[PDB]
């Protein structure tokens, strides 16, 4: 790997610089290098990894959606034939996106998840696994589409089970996991009722636990609770 010669601490330092410079591809490459050193990641380091790849894949997803929309319009009645270029370029972006997802899933499988024993790390990584299978599912159209969806579901479900047992209902990782699994239900699994039920239950159980929190913890939990509310408003 190209980062093999750089110190772990230097990779982390440069990931933080890349973030400040909004150089998310660089940030992701630095954090991949850090993971490949073989040591477990701290809370801060896990969040550098997630932020980096979230931004990279987020840009790819936005581009893919633009191109998919153009492609869909090209296949409507009355649309003039413009040749293979739209499909080709959508496929190019799609392949790049799948590559990033596969890279992230590869890091999780080799060997972040298996060494993650604490709830906060294990749930975090399983949430990531669910998310990146979800992104693969967004672009899947073939024989393995059902299996990709089930891979996302399975990762989310394991994360949910651990989070319910080991974390308070206001824990931000627990809340974010539930937010995203709810979106999985609505957007991927064709299960809007499950999505709504999960968002509502999550919100209500968090509300009941807010009284236990400091001001700073309250702030962070309520931010994610508002996102649950926003989705519920969108869906009802």
């Amino acid at each position: 790997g190209a980062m093999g010669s750089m110190e772990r601490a230097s990779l982390i330092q440069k990931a933080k610089l890349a973030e400040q410079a909004e150089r998310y591809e660089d940030m992701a490459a630095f954090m991949k290098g850090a993971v490949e050193k073989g040591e477990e990641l701290s809370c801060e380091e896990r969040n550098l990894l997630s932020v980096a790849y979230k931004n990279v894949v987020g840009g790819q997803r936005a581009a893919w959606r633009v191109l998919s929309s153009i492609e869909q319009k090209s296949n409507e009645e009355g649309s003039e034939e413009k040749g293979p270029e739209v499909r080709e370029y959508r496929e190019k972006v799609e392949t790049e996106l799948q590559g990033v997802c596969d890279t992230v899933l590869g890091l999780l499988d080799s060997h972040l998840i298996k060494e993650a024993g604490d709830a906060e790390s294990r749930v975090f990584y399983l949430k990531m696994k669910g998310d990146y299978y979800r992104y693969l599912a967004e672009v899947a159209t073939g024989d393995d589409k059902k299996r990709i969806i089930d891979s996302a579901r399975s990762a989310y479900q394991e994360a949910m089970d651990i989070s319910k047992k080991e974390m308070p209902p206001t824990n931000p990782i627990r809340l974010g996991l539930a937010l995203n699994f709810s979106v999985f239900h609505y957007e991927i699994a064709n299960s809007p009722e499950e999505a709504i039920s999960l968002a509502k239950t999550t919100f209500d159980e968090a509300m009941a636990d807010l009284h236990t929190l400091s001001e700073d913890s309250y702030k962070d939990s309520t931010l994610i609770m508002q996102l649950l509310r926003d989705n519920l408003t969108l869906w009802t």
């Binding site: 998310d131 974010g176 937010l179 995203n180 979106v183 957007e187 996102l227 926003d230 989705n231 869906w235």
Partner: peptide, 5 residues
């Protein structure tokens, strides 16, 4: 699109 984190 719905919110995710």
């Amino acid at each position: 699109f719905p919110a995710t984190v």
